[PDB]
Amino acid sequence: QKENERLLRDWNDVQGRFEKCVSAKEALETDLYKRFILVLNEKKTKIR
Amino acid sequence: KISNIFEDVEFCVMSGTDSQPKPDLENRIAEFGGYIVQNPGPDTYCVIAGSENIRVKNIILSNKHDVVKPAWLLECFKTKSFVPWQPRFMIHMCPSTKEHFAREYDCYGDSYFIDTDLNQLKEVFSGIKNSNEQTPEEMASLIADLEYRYSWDCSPLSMFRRHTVYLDSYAVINDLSTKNEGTRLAIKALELRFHGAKVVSCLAEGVSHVIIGEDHSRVADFKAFRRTFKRKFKILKESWVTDSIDKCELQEENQYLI
């Protein structure tokens, strides 16, 4: 019980850190996409 | 004295102490032959100031000249020559200069003569405020359309944007008295969201795929729904999703043949 419980605590910690890291990566991808979309729309308007 | 090009041009260096003392700036511009006037006049090509005063605010109101940062002066010093004006120094700028910029520059820091490197593009993006104005569905759809228009969806890390795979992690519908603790459904959700796919728990008309867990002994309902539903679903083996971890590689189109 002690072995599986602290391994499950480690599993919970790794799940949390993986979730937050993936969320940070997704947020960076999303805001980079937003900024690129804004500049691309600016350039599209300039081209038009 | 050194750069005579700054002669015949008036410079209203009426402030500037945070970076360098104003007398030092005056001495340097005199060494470059800049006209040091203590107050703006309708012959000064640009007004130079540091901290922003009521005089600068009035010039903003009474649009007479441009409030150029001392950093542009530092750029001129390090270049030892004239530095073209960029839309990052002038806090306030005359409408004529606004038209001049708009005629040959974008509304942002991007310029047609000086390209922006990684750091410059990062600064341009950061200067543009970031907020939420587009819905996630619309923004994802536009991203997918632009990526398909120029073949950007072929990135090996994000291919599940279009494939909204539904994971039937719930045996029953609308029952909050149960919670699957210690299950690998969270692992499957993380794997799906790694490539960009987002799972949904509410059934709607936008879901075009139904995927059940390891309990594949439910072929009877699939068989019954094949005759009923015209939307012929596609179900692959569970080894394919594990290939994203073991092989960690995409599957080529040559596998889809006769």
Degrees to nearest 5, angle at CA B149 with B248 and B137: 75
- Which of B55, B48, B51 has its CA nearest to residue B28? B48
Q: What is d(CA B139, CA B145) in angstroms, rounded to the nearest whole number?
A: 10
Interface size between A and B, measured as CB pairs under 8 A = 38
Instruction: Find chain A residues with C-beta within 8 A of B104's C-beta.
Output: none
- Ramachandran assignment for B174, one of left (phi > 0), alpha (psi -120 to 50 degrees), beta (any other): left
Burial class (CB in 10 A: 0-12, 13-18, 19+), B103: exposed
**Cα separations in angstroms, B186 against B132, B143, B183, B199:** 28, 26, 7, 11
Burial class (CB in 10 A: 0-12, 13-18, 19+), B32: buried
User: Is A40 an interface residue toward B (CB < 8 Å)?
Assistant: yes
Q: Select the residue from A30, A44, A47, A48 to test the B interface by mutation, using most B Cβ atoms within 10 A.
A: A30
User: Is A41 an interface residue toward B (CB < 8 Å)?
Assistant: no
Contact A40 B146 (CB under 8 A): yes
Q: What is d(CA B39, CA B56) in angstroms, rounded to the nearest whole number?
A: 11
- Which of B17, B194, B22 has its CA nearest to residue A29? B194
Q: Mention every residue, 6+ apart, whose C-beta is less than 8 A from residue B69.
A: B88, B89, B90, B91
Instruction: Find chain A residues with C-beta within 8 A of B110's C-beta.
Output: 39, 42
Q: What is d(CA A22, CA A24) in angstroms, rounded to the nearest whole number?
A: 5
DSSP H helices in chain B: 22-31, 54-61, 70-79, 95-104, 118-127, 136-149, 185-194, 219-228, 238-243
> Which residues in B have their CB inside 8 Å of a CB on A?
106-108, 110, 124-125, 128, 130, 134, 139, 142-143, 146, 158, 182, 186, 190, 193-194
Q: What is d(CA B148, CA A5) in angstroms, rounded to the nearest whole number?
A: 47
Contact B82, B76 (CB under 8 A): yes
Among chain A residues, the shortest Cα distance to B128 is held by: A35
B/e letters for B36-75, b = 16+ CB within 10 Å, e = fewer, are beeebeeebebbbbbeeeebbeebeeeebbbbbbbebbeb
Among chain B residues, the shortest Cα distance to A33 is held by: B143
Contact B17, B48 (CB under 8 A): no
For residue B150, give how far its alpha carbon lies from the nearest alpha carbon of chain A (Å): 13
B/e letters for B190-213, b = 16+ CB within 10 Å, e = fewer, are ebbbbbbbeeeeeeeeeeeebbee
Of the candidates A15, A34, A39, the beta carbon closest to that of B108 is on: A39
Contact A26 B193 (CB under 8 A): yes
User: Is A38 an interface residue toward B (CB < 8 Å)?
Assistant: yes
Contact B167, B188 (CB under 8 A): yes
Contact B191, B244 (CB under 8 A): yes
**Cα separations in angstroms, B211 against B5, B184, B199:** 73, 15, 11
